[PDB]
Structure 1
Amino acid sequence: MRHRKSGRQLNRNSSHRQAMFRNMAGSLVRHEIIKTTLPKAKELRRVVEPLITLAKTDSVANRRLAFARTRDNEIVAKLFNELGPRFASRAGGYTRILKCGFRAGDNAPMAYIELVDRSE
């Protein structure tokens, strides 16, 4: 049912999800690999790939982005020079999802989410 809703509801309030995904997507650029859960990681591509594609267009009016949606205070000094010129040209697919099964003795679907470091 859920009428027309196509995005999954996961865990916590929509407000907590907003900030958790904001914090995870910005930090994955520096961590390169994050360990988390499969349902959560399958929705991370929806916010971390457009953050890398944000450096595909070049303009003095494009540097004020990542300030109203998916804020991070440190990528805004390096990302436009590092991944904008050649990597962001591919406009998506920068992520690898690693299905790892159980974490320990509990029930949580464990996953690792990483960024591709070389395209060829």
Structure 2
Amino acid sequence: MRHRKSGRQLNRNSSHRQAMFRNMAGSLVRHEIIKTTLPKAKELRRVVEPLITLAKTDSVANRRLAFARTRDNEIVAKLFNELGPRFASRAGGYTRILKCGFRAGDNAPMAYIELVDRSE
């Protein structure tokens, strides 16, 4: 059935998919733009949209939330300040994903995902 099960499989188990996204989920917060395949660029938003939502305003004990996804405190020091408050007027709508090319090892379309307010 796979009845109302959310999120694309993207091979193997949930921790392998998490380790695959761990190669790019920090790069998107660091550089405010990242490239990968069309399905991966759409699914890379999961937990990361809720983490930008968590970063709009300051509360207690929140620095450790989602940290098992990427265990890097540099991209977490970006939250509540250099990322988050810039979207507080709109309360949502943080990121956009578009097509840019194709692979040759597989027939994967390439796509880029970025933040809608960034200096470059």
| TM-score, length basis structure 2 | 0.75
Give the whole-Å Cα distance in 2 for the aligned partners of 1:23 and 1:117.
Answer: 23
After superposition, give the CA deviation of every residue in 1:36-79 in whole Å (9 maximum; x if it has no partner): 01111111122222222221231243344343555432022232
CA separation of 1:19 and 1:89: change in aligned 2, threshold 3 A: farther
CA separation of 1:2 and 1:59: change in aligned 2, threshold 3 A: closer
Give the whole-Å Cα distance in 2 for the aligned partners of 1:107 and 1:41.
Answer: 15
Higher mean C-alpha displacement, 64-73 vs 25-34: 64-73
Does the Cα contact within 8 Å between 1:34 and 1:114 map onto a contact in 2? Answer: yes
Give the whole-Å Cα distance in 1 for the aligned partners of 2:118 and 2:66.
Answer: 24
The percent of aligned pairs where both chains have the same amino acid is 100
CA separation of 1:47 and 1:65: change in aligned 2, threshold 3 A: closer
Higher mean C-alpha displacement, 76-85 vs 56-65: 56-65
Q: After TM superposition, give the deviation of residue 109 of structure 1 in Å.
A: 1.8
Q: After TM superposition, give the deviation of residue 105 of structure 1 in Å.
A: 7.3
Higher mean C-alpha displacement, 82-91 vs 36-45: 82-91
Give the whole-Å Cα distance in 1 for the aligned partners of 2:101 and 2:70.
Answer: 29
| TM-score, length basis structure 1 | 0.75
Q: After TM superposition, give the deviation of residue 106 of structure 1 in Å.
A: 4.2
Gaps of 5+ in 1: none
Give the superposed CA RMSD: 3.0
CA separation of 1:24 and 1:106: change in aligned 2, threshold 3 A: closer
CA separation of 1:36 and 1:3: change in aligned 2, threshold 3 A: same
CA separation of 1:65 and 1:13: change in aligned 2, threshold 3 A: closer
